[PDB]
Amino acid sequence: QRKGTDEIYGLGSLPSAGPGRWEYLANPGNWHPERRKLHEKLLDQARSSALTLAESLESDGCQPTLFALRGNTATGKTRIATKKIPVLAAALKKTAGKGCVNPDVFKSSLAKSETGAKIFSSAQVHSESSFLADRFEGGLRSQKTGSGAIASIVVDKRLSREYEIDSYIQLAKETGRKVELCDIDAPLENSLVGVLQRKPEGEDPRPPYPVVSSGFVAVRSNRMYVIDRFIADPSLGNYRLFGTAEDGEKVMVASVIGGEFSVENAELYEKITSPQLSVTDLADKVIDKELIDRLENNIADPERAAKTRAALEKYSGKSWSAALAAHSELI
């Protein structure tokens, strides 16, 4: 569909859609009362989940920390958090994964609008979900636990660009939080098939091709800037970069831990700090039998191989761009 929920549920003369439309809508009172109520309910839920996370982390001895999960769409971020950040894995278990700062966590609820079925598309609810995420993050800034300590929080966003990274470092510095950053990379094609595997009945986003490609370019091009921040300031926190081997498994590539910088996989480090651009397109590559076989050849896990296969076959004969476009349009 077409009209955004910010336009449908906003009240009055809506400011032309660039910012100016944000402060207007950033004011929780330019919305219809029913929508205002939905916002309050969703923020209460998210805040409850975040506090559960924070109390779990503190009980497990974690100093106030901003856990940042950097990386492009469908690169395996969730599995890395689960396996490689044990204290956070323990916390997320208690909330079934809820409580992280991420606009996408509000999308399903906004899309269903308490009616029992999804009636708005992800794109239709995105601005509103972003507004809620910003209000959610704002309240978390100085949120305390029961011991009066600053609450640890989790930021689950692409975090590709310098300005975003700087902003979260500044937030951490101002609130006395360490930054624990895991940066997760996969080849662009892995993200594309990852998106096609996400089912609309799930809550993981299904963006169109340009989002995944531009995200890939941005995350790779700005990666070394992020690493430089940790190399320069040992007190900032810790950094780990995981990349994807040929067989699809994640491996440590570079790290800054306790101020010590190491490169665990120099070959991958050279590769995953560059977008592999040329003057003129993976977007036009057709999903054919060969491509599916080519991807299957490097997937050994039966369940993963079957799911990859099924997702691709649904779009057999279409270009990556056409495939992700069609997949994204599903409600």
Binding site: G18, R161, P207, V211, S214, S262, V263
Partner: protein, 98 residues
């Protein structure tokens, strides 16, 4: 493979930064020659900012980072896009998603 540590890790990082900086600049230089050759519309941030929002809701306020993000995207990532009006649709798509 063998983990690079200490001075070797730092020197590898330094040299790799130089390599990627050269590649970064080169991608844009080559794209601009090709753009001139095919008659692609000259990048105009202000005209761009008329038809779409480049602000990321006021988070991106640095003029230097803002021009550099979109000019480079326009030329390097979307070489077959000929007009800023076309590119506008792309940018709008990008901010419709996380």
């Amino acid at each position: 493979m063998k983990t690079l540590t200490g001075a070797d890790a730092l020197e590898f990082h330094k040299k790799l930064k130089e390599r990627n900086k050269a590649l970064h600049a080169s991608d844009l230089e080559l794209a601009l020659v090709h753009a001139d050759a095919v008659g692609k519309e000259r990048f105009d941030l202000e005209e761009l900012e008329k038809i779409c929002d480049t602000s990321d809701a006021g988070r991106l306020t640095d003029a230097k980072e803002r021009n550099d993000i979109y000019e480079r995207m326009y030329y390097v990532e979307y070489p077959n896009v000929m007009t800023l009006k076309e590119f506008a649709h792309i940018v709008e798509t990008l901010f419709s998603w996380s």
